[PDB]
Ligand binder design. Structure first.
Ligand code: HEM
Length: 371
């Protein structure tokens, strides 16, 4: 109901690799994107396609793979080589079934995190763990874009967080059942696991190149929203009378950080300003199952308030453990941004970026009880 696996959390537990046959037109373009962009015969092959009706997609894992395919195609079509040459008009052939499918899942008709990370992976040998070496994506855009690195390390962090997320019910039960000792354990447990997920985060150095990321992959993950290059938007010819602007799919559409902001009663989405508004806006780009879950956390009693009520340094400590773990993650994520965007982009937009993240970080910092 909340679509949260015990093992991989927000991620898609075991995603469909193969579409039905009726959608083989789709799978070839998508399967082979490194070549059709680098040759030039993507936009022409997308130009003349069959408006393949959506009805023949039975179950979920199908519909999600379809979004991934359709979406990967739409990024590749609209941006092309990604050298300042842009397609403002998306065909009636690709747009109408993608816009429909996207209405089925209540996701935007754009590549989002749910698609290009959560739904976009595979174990190579299914008896071997979920580790970088024994995993791979289903789709890239170009070669040496380091799509594997970005998508998988993202995914791996999702999975690290699954171990924390599955504790959450214990937290709310313990609170209701008035079981202090449990609640304390569960909170420390959560902090412990969010600390793991930091180590996991270290891998982004190993498996992604700054110059390669910023240049190649960053372009294909960008969206029409607040886009000089598509200021008016992208026209979904057939479906929408007008062009509709939708933001690109980052890990800022991840539920993980938001999940724990909410659990720990960190009022990020309170106040005006980009910081809150952005975070709030991003929930749209999450699956509705996952939106529901964050809404449910909010509805439950405040862990923060409970902890403060009790006058119990034990709880306070464990609470702060979680909060510190979350700050640490955001603190490290900042260093990543420096390395992978700031420095590249130089070989006050970059200052705006950093101030968004630092507000969010600071907001998270301020929820500490010792400080
Ligand atoms: C090279 C790797 C990465 C880069 C360059 C990067 C860059 C950014 C940037 C520029 C933003 C600001 C919003 C936006 O532009 O979309 C952002 C936000 C965000 N990123 Fe990343 N990111 C990276 C990896 C990750 C990973 C692996 C995660 C989680 C697994 C993550 C989680 C987030 C979250 C949750 C936000 C929203 C702000 C927040 O809640 O703190 N990022 N990232």
């Amino acid at each position: 109901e909340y679509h949260i696996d015990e093992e991989v959390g927000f991620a898609l537990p075991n995603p469909q690799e193969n579409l039905p046959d009726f959608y083989n037109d789709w799978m070839f373009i998508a399967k082979h994107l490194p070549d059709l962009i680098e040759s030039g015969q993507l936009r022409e092959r997308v130009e003349k396609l069959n408006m393949l009706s959506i009805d023949h997609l039975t179950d979920h894992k199908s519909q999600r793979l379809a979004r991934l395919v359709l979406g990967c195609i739409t990024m590749a079509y609209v941006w092309g080589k990604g050298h300042g040459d842009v397609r403002k008009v998306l065909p009636r052939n690709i747009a109408v079934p993608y816009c429909q499918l996207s209405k089925k899942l209540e996701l935007p008709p754009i590549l989002v995190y749910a698609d290009c990370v959560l739904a976009n992976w595979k174990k190579k040998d299914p008896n071997k763990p979920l580790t970088y070496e024994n995993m791979d994506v289903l789709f890239s855009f170009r070669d040496g874009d380091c799509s594997k690195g970005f998508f998988l390390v993202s995914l791996l962090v999702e999975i690290a967080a699954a171990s924390a997320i599955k504790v959450i019910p214990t937290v709310f039960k313990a609170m209701q059942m008035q079981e202090r000792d449990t609640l304390l354990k569960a909170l420390l447990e959560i902090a412990s696991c969010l600390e793991k997920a930091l180590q996991v985060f270290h891998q982004i150095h190993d498996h992604v190149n700054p110059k390669a990321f910023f240049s190649v992959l960053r372009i294909y993950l960008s969206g029409w929203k607040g886009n000089p290059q598509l200021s008016d938007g992208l026209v979904y010819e057939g479906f929408w009378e007008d062009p509709k602007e939708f933001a690109g799919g980052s890990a800022g559409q991840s539920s993980v950080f938001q999940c724990f902001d909410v659990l720990l009663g960190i009022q990020q989405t309170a106040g005006g300003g980009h910081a809150a508004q952005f975070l709030q806006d991003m929930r749209r780009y999450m699956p509705p199952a996952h939106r529901n879950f964050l809404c449910s956390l909010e509805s439950n009693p405040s862990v923060r308030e409970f902890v403060l009520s009790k006058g119990d340094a034990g709880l306070r400590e464990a609470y702060d453990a979680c909060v510190k773990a979350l700050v640490s993650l955001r603190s490290y994520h900042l260093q990543i941004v420096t390395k992978y965007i700031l420095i590249p982009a130089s070989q006050t937009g970059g200052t705006d970026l950093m101030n968004f993240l630092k507000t969010v970080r600071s907001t998270t910092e301020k929820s500490l009880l010792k400080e």
